[PDB]
């Protein structure tokens, strides 16, 4: 029965080790992402949460019919 | 010896030679804030896919 239907314990053991590593990495990545989102939303210095401002390319820098703009 | 300017001459944009130095900051601007750093590097696939609750891709 053991020869025909199953494997040794080392296979399940090391598959479990691989599964555990994947899951623990995913967990720490999730926590880190939550912290990064908190900081990027509070500070606005990150690539995320960039709210539009006015394009400076719309300003007209030509003499404006009076000297003081 | 005064000649009256012809039609269209007093409205020309002309050049002026001056000793007055070109003002550097006539708007009295402050220093501009520093930009955000930039995007850089090669794009690698996200580690362990999307990572949504139980999805492995
Ligand atoms: C023709 C057949 C064919 O071409 O199949 C080739 C294809 C080749 O498979 P493979 O990538 O070599 O095998 C990798 C393993 O299956 C290992 O699979 P994996 O780890 O690549 O899994 C991919 C992943 C992503 O896969 C999916 O999201 C869709 C899979 C179906 C979800 C189950 C509901 C529908 C049934 O699966 C999941 O995330 C599981 C979540 C699914 C449940 C979603 C929540 C609601 C459940 C319903 C209640 O096999 C299949 O398509 C089997 C049917 C699907
Ligand atoms: C000697 C006499 C006295 C003792 C009798 C012993 C009793 C044993 C017989 C009972 C059958 C066991 C039930 C089957 C469960 C096993 C299912 C599965 O685990 O088996 C797969 C293997 O497949 C097997 O073939 C199971 C198929 C059994 C299907 C039973 C169907 C019987 C129906 C009877 C119909 C008869 C004719 C009907 C006439 C109308 C394993 O997949 P595999 O990917 O390998 O895993 C890797 C393991 N390796 C490395 C060893 C290869």
UniProtKB/TrEMBL annotation, chain A:
It comes from the Eukaryota. Residues 10-42 form a coiled coil. Keywords: Coiled coil, Electron transport, Membrane, Mitochondrion, Mitochondrion inner membrane, Respiratory chain, Transit peptide, Transmembrane, Transmembrane helix, Transport, Ubiquinone. GO terms for cellular component: mitochondrial inner membrane; nucleoplasm; respiratory chain complex I. It is found in: Mitochondrion inner membrane. Belongs to the complex I NDUFB5 subunit family. Complex I is composed of 45 different subunits. Accessory subunit of the mitochondrial membrane respiratory chain NADH dehydrogenase (Complex I), that is believed not to be involved in catalysis. Complex I functions in the transfer of electrons from NADH to the respiratory chain. The immediate electron acceptor for the enzyme is believed to be ubiquinone. This is NADH dehydrogenase [ubiquinone] 1 beta subcomplex subunit 5, mitochondrial. It comes from Sus scrofa (Pig). The lineage of its organism: Eukaryota, Metazoa, Chordata, Craniata, Vertebrata. The chain holds residues 121 to 189 of 189 of the full protein.
Automatic annotation (TrEMBL), chain B:
The chain holds residues 193 to 249 of 249 of the full protein. The gene is NDUFA8. Complex I is composed of 45 different subunits. It is found in: Mitochondrion intermembrane space. Residues 18-49 are annotated as: Disordered. Accessory subunit of the mitochondrial membrane respiratory chain NADH dehydrogenase (Complex I), that is believed not to be involved in catalysis. Complex I functions in the transfer of electrons from NADH to the respiratory chain. The immediate electron acceptor for the enzyme is believed to be ubiquinone. Signal peptide: none annotated. It comes from the Eukaryota. Belongs to the complex I NDUFA8 subunit family. This is NADH dehydrogenase [ubiquinone] 1 alpha subcomplex subunit 8. Residues 31-45 have a biased composition (Basic and acidic residues).
